[PDB]
Design an enzyme around this catalytic site. Sequence first.
Site, PDB file in Angstrom:
ATOM      1  N   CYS A  95       0.838  -1.190   0.000  1.00  6.84           N
ATOM      2  CA  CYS A  95       0.000   0.000   0.000  1.00  6.84           C
ATOM      3  C   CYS A  95       0.876   1.244   0.000  1.00  6.84           C
ATOM      4  O   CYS A  95       2.024   1.210   0.438  1.00  6.84           O
ATOM      5  CB  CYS A  95      -0.947   0.021   1.200  1.00  6.84           C
ATOM      6  SG  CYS A  95      -2.109   1.376   1.078  1.00  6.84           S
ATOM      7  N   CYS A 124      -2.162   4.273   7.130  1.00  3.62           N
ATOM      8  CA  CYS A 124      -3.214   4.404   8.138  1.00  3.62           C
ATOM      9  C   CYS A 124      -2.809   3.735   9.453  1.00  3.62           C
ATOM     10  O   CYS A 124      -2.446   2.556   9.481  1.00  3.62           O
ATOM     11  CB  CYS A 124      -4.514   3.795   7.614  1.00  3.62           C
ATOM     12  SG  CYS A 124      -5.048   4.519   6.029  1.00  3.62           S
ATOM     13  N   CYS A 138      -4.569   0.370  10.274  1.00  2.86           N
ATOM     14  CA  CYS A 138      -4.681  -0.627   9.216  1.00  2.86           C
ATOM     15  C   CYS A 138      -4.647  -2.049   9.763  1.00  2.86           C
ATOM     16  O   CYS A 138      -3.700  -2.435  10.450  1.00  2.86           O
ATOM     17  CB  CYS A 138      -3.547  -0.434   8.213  1.00  2.86           C
ATOM     18  SG  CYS A 138      -3.572  -1.698   6.959  1.00  2.86           S
TER      19      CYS A 138
HETATM   20  N1  LIG Z   1      -8.642  -1.577  11.888  1.00  7.75           N
HETATM   21  C1  LIG Z   1      -9.668  -1.617  10.999  1.00  7.75           C
HETATM   22  N2  LIG Z   1     -10.943  -1.853  11.372  1.00  7.75           N
HETATM   23  C2  LIG Z   1     -11.957  -1.878  10.480  1.00  7.75           C
HETATM   24  N3  LIG Z   1     -11.787  -1.685   9.157  1.00  7.75           N
HETATM   25  C3  LIG Z   1     -10.554  -1.440   8.659  1.00  7.75           C
HETATM   26  C4  LIG Z   1      -9.402  -1.381   9.572  1.00  7.75           C
HETATM   27  N4  LIG Z   1      -8.315  -1.136   8.822  1.00  7.75           N
HETATM   28  C5  LIG Z   1      -8.733  -1.026   7.535  1.00  7.75           C
HETATM   29  N5  LIG Z   1     -10.057  -1.203   7.455  1.00  7.75           N
HETATM   30  C6  LIG Z   1     -10.868  -1.120   6.225  1.00  7.75           C
HETATM   31  O1  LIG Z   1     -10.808  -2.322   5.498  1.00  7.75           O
HETATM   32  C7  LIG Z   1     -11.045  -1.992   4.124  1.00  7.75           C
HETATM   33  C8  LIG Z   1     -10.002  -2.720   3.266  1.00  7.75           C
HETATM   34  S1  LIG Z   1      -8.379  -2.010   3.432  1.00  7.75           S
HETATM   35  C9  LIG Z   1      -7.814  -2.307   1.792  1.00  7.75           C
HETATM   36  C10 LIG Z   1      -8.603  -1.485   0.775  1.00  7.75           C
HETATM   37  C11 LIG Z   1      -7.958  -0.139   0.429  1.00  7.75           C
HETATM   38  N6  LIG Z   1      -6.504  -0.144   0.729  1.00  7.75           N
HETATM   39  C12 LIG Z   1      -8.657   0.966   1.165  1.00  7.75           C
HETATM   40  O2  LIG Z   1      -8.161   1.562   2.117  1.00  7.75           O
HETATM   41  O3  LIG Z   1      -9.775   1.317   0.813  1.00  7.75           O
HETATM   42  C13 LIG Z   1     -10.970  -0.469   3.997  1.00  7.75           C
HETATM   43  O4  LIG Z   1     -12.261   0.189   4.001  1.00  7.75           O
HETATM   44  C14 LIG Z   1     -10.261  -0.101   5.272  1.00  7.75           C
HETATM   45  O5  LIG Z   1     -10.411   1.278   5.607  1.00  7.75           O
HETATM   46  S1  SF4 Z   2      -6.259   0.854   5.534  1.00  8.59           S
HETATM   47 FE1  SF4 Z   2      -4.348  -0.095   5.232  1.00  8.59          FE
HETATM   48  S2  SF4 Z   2      -4.315  -1.016   3.198  1.00  8.59           S
HETATM   49 FE2  SF4 Z   2      -6.117   0.684   3.104  1.00  8.59          FE
HETATM   50  S3  SF4 Z   2      -5.153   2.629   2.559  1.00  8.59           S
HETATM   51 FE3  SF4 Z   2      -4.874   2.437   4.837  1.00  8.59          FE
HETATM   52  S4  SF4 Z   2      -2.720   1.517   5.102  1.00  8.59           S
HETATM   53 FE4  SF4 Z   2      -3.501   1.035   2.983  1.00  8.59          FE
END
Ligand SMILES: Nc1ncnc2c1ncn2[C@@H]1O[C@H](CSCC[C@H](N)C(=O)O)[C@@H](O)[C@H]1O
Ligand code: SF4
Length: 262
Positions: free
Chosen positions: A13, A17, A20
């Site tokens: 990625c 975040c 994440c």
């Molecule tokens: N700790 C967490 N709890 C709940 N949802 C989460 C999370 N971390 C990530 N997600 C969510 O899971 C989904 C897939 S993350 C991968 C998709 C893409 N990178 C994106 O950010 O959209 C995204 O909506 C993300 O914001």
């Molecule tokens: S939630 Fe995770 S995988 Fe999606 S944009 Fe953020 S760092 Fe990337």
Amino acid sequence: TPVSVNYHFTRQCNYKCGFCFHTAKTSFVLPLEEAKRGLLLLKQAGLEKINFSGGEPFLQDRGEYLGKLVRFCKEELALPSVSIVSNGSLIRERWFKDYGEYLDILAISCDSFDEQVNALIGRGQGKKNHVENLQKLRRWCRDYKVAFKINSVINRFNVDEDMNEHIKALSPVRWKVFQCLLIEGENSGEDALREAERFLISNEEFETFLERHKEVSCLVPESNQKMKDSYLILDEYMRFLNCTDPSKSILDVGVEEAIKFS
Ligand SMILES: Nc1ncnc2c1ncn2[C@@H]1O[C@H](CSCC[C@H](N)C(=O)O)[C@@H](O)[C@H]1O
Ligand code: SF4
């Protein structure tokens, strides 16, 4: 024998975040024909809906890898529902021209309309226009006839935000609202790539956020309990994972044997 599947085909990625829950533990992505083989196995085991995720799906080969799998699912597998979840930052309009006709749904992650909050939680690469990017992508979905959804992770930094008017102005097909989820080994642990504990909210705080947005008719809540019970992950090796040691890959033992483990 599943009906819907979340295929996190990559862990790479471009964002950072802080919460994440599917982190950059590997750089492995299957050769295209191996993924095509697994997707067919899923179709033959009865799959109807596929959701491509990660990781950032549009990162690999500037989106061409994803576009090829999207096209394979719609054209060759005849899956009636093909979706992607993306942070949106790497999507080119040319991708829509080349692949948009095969895509049913594009869900863009947006956790706040306060561009300070977004930079703070790591949702960006420096430009701090992540929310202005959202209206462009909404317009592209409209022009290329793709359903537009918004995904939001509710966490410590947006738990008191009022997003009603902002979400209404974007008129998404759905607003999927996830309670921040802790997964050990992913965003929890001294060796984990992220430590999300400081982002977590209680169920009561989550319910308060939902109640504040009850006028948004397209809102769909995804609590911690809902994710643990119904969110199934197919990882970058096409092994099954849940949100609570991964299974054997479906490419080696098949869908039936691989689903038993999870
Ligand atoms: N700790 C967490 N709890 C709940 N949802 C989460 C999370 N971390 C990530 N997600 C969510 O899971 C989904 C897939 S993350 C991968 C998709 C893409 N990178 C994106 O950010 O959209 C995204 O909506 C993300 O914001
Ligand atoms: S939630 Fe995770 S995988 Fe999606 S944009 Fe953020 S760092 Fe990337």
